[model samples]
Target: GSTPDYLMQLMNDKKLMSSLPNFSGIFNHLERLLDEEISRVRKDMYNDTL
Candidate 1:
């Protein structure tokens, strides 16, 4: 529904995945954007380990 809802739900289930896209019809783009966000945080964790 809203960005905050997406942030909270956090893809905990595939059911939400389907419903969220139904709600906004653009969560596919959100998946792409958050995919990068996950990668960015992954790199930050590694860099901090170094």
Candidate 2:
């Protein structure tokens, strides 16, 4: 009923680890995605003329 970000948030929660393996991977991906998204948005803003 949602997108990847919601899944990531669910996965990021430590309580979910009991039912899932390598839950840390989600947090790792989330960290990278957050940084990448922020950087991408900043670049887009810089290049935007609007």
Candidate 3:
């Protein structure tokens, strides 16, 4: 179904995936932290900030 495509898009960002080799095992932790940090920010957070 097309619904899973949203999640598949996460894997589509190859350049981003390449930058997080050691942290791949901690994706859940990283995702939560990323969301938390962005939600707390006064400025826009970039993809690199994660």
List of clashing residue pairs for candidate 2: none
lDDT string for model 3 (1-50, tens) is: 12434334544444465677677665656655544444444233333355
- Top lDDT hit: 1
Cα lDDT for residue 49, model 3?
50
Model 2 residue 16 lDDT score: 51
Q: What lDDT tens digits, residue by residue, belong to model 2 across residues 1-50? A: 22355435544453355446566466656545555665565556556645
Q: Which prediction has more favorable lDDT, 1 or 3?
A: 1
Candidate 2: regions farther than 4 A off: 1-26
Off by over 4 Å in 1: 1-28
Task: Please name the candidate that would achieve the greatest TM-score relative to the true structure.
Answer: 1
Q: 1-50, model 1: which lDDT tens digit per residue?
A: 11334433444543455556765464447556655665565566567667
Question: What are the lDDT scores of the predictions, listed in order?
Answer: 0.53, 0.52, 0.48
- TM-score-better candidate, 1 vs 3: 1
TM-score for model 1? 0.46
TM-score computed on alpha carbons, candidate 2: 0.42
Alpha-carbon RMSD to native, per candidate: 8.1, 8.5, 11.6
